[PDB]
Design a protein around this ligand. Structure first.
Ligand SMILES: Nc1ncnc2c1ncn2[C@@H]1O[C@H](COP(=O)(O)O)[C@@H](OP(=O)(O)O)[C@H]1O
Ligand SMILES: CC1=C(/C=C/C(C)=C/C=C/C(C)=C\CO)C(C)(C)CCC1
Ligand SMILES: [Ca+2]
Length: 341
């Protein structure tokens, strides 16, 4: 099948704002498709393959706009399918799942320019850093197609449905997570700091201006969410809210199990709840990506697992931003049944 989408460079306005947040970063963006989803330029080379990637009936996807609960979900989804074999779940998350669109943030043609954004390049564990770059060159598709049939595939992605095989849900199951845009904005701001993506200069307002305006990775934020929303009625789609994980974890697990075709006992659902305790998770080496810190590519004072709180966007928004945020979220939920807890 051919890729039904074209792309356009950013116009002056758009580009001006973006460079005000990610100027220092080597990878540039491009608007893909009619909705103009923001994708790192490299994505283009594999775009068509992903659109046509061969799916398998046993494939399980954990999708979401980034920073909405992907990690928590992957861990639960993995345990449930592998009969709560906590022992075997101790291997790195990035090894148990395939991050479909995780490659695009790296542009090989710019290797040199990358370490320059690191406070200290002379202190990198080169044997590892370089290996990271290599893996990060392998297109998403290739990594999926490499897994033999006798191995269940666990895919992770922040790609909207429109960029993946349409009708895919006829073959694979997916769990899409969503979270309050505002809290997502915040978490993303810090995550971008974690990997040295933002000009050490700019602040959060700048980031937010870029975010709700559809100029950040994989946004427009609402089109992304709405796409999965419209498919929640499907038997292979499970739409969840990050807020509910905090409100009723025991009940969220139940739903997932029921969804993935399992039956956990009060004990299993409970046994999983303790395993997902924030502090216990935040310190879990298999899922906190802290191994990366050894490499030398994580910012001091940042962590892949931060607070795990809800509604703390209020500590970052000023009255001005707050109004503009309300109007924005208000305007995208008009004439749609999409509602956040
Ligand atoms: N076990 C857990 N329980 C609650 N929140 C968790 C969690 N593990 C990670 N998180 C939170 O989930 C967000 C990451 O989302 P994702 O995995 O999709 O990128 C972060 O939000 P915060 O930045 O608000 O802390 C992170 O701290
Ligand atoms: C390879 C590579 C990098 C690291 C990418 C990482 C660490 C990705 C994992 C991201 C996650 C897990 C969050 C989204 O779900 C950085 C940007 C340093 C610069 C250059 C090459
Ligand atoms: Ca350098």
């Amino acid at each position: 099948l051919p890729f039904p989408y074209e792309f356009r460079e950013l116009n002056p306005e758009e580009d001006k704002l973006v460079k005000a947040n990610l100027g220092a970063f080597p990878t540039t963006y491009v608007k893909l498709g009619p909705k103009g989803y923001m994708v790192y330029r490299p994505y283009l080379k594999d775009a068509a393959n992903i659109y046509n990637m061969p799916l398998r009936p046993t494939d399980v996807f954990v999708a979401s706009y980034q920073r909405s609960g992907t990690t928590m979900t992957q861990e639960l989804v993995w345990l449930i399918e592998n009969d709560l074999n906590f022992e075997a779940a101790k291997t790195y998350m990035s090894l148990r799942y395939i991050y479909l669109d995780g490659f695009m943030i790296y542009d090989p043609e710019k290797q040199e320019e990358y370490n320059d954004i690191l406070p200290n390049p002379e202190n990198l564990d080169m044997e590892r850093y370089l290996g990271l770059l290599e893996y990060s060159s392998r297109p998403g598709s290739s990594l999926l197609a490499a897994v033999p049939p006798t191995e269940k595939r666990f895919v992770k992605t922040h790609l909207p449905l429109s960029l993946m095989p349409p009708n895919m849900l006829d073959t694979v199951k997916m769990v899409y997570l969503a979270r309050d845009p505002r809290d997502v904005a915040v978490s993303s701001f810090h995550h971008a700091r974690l990997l040295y993506l933002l000009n050490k200069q700019s602040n959060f307002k700048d980031f937010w201006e870029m975010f709700h305006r559809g100029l950040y990775t994989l946004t427009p934020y609402f089109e992304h969410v709405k796409e999965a929303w419209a498919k929640r009625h499907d038997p292979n789609m499970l739409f969840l809210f990050y807020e509910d994980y905090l409100k009723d974890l025991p009940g969220c697990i139940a739903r997932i199990a029921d969804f993935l075709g399992k039956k956990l006992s009060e004990e299993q659902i409970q046994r999983l709840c303790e395993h997902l305790n924030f502090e216990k998770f935040k310190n879990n080496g298999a899922v906190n990506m802290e191994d990366y810190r050894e490499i030398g590519i994580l910012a001091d004072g940042e962590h892949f697992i931060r607070k795990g709180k809800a509604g703390c966007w209020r500590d970052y928004f000023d009255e001005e931003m707050t109004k503009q945020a309300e109007k924005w979220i208000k305007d995208n939920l008009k004439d749609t049944d999409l509602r956040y807890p």
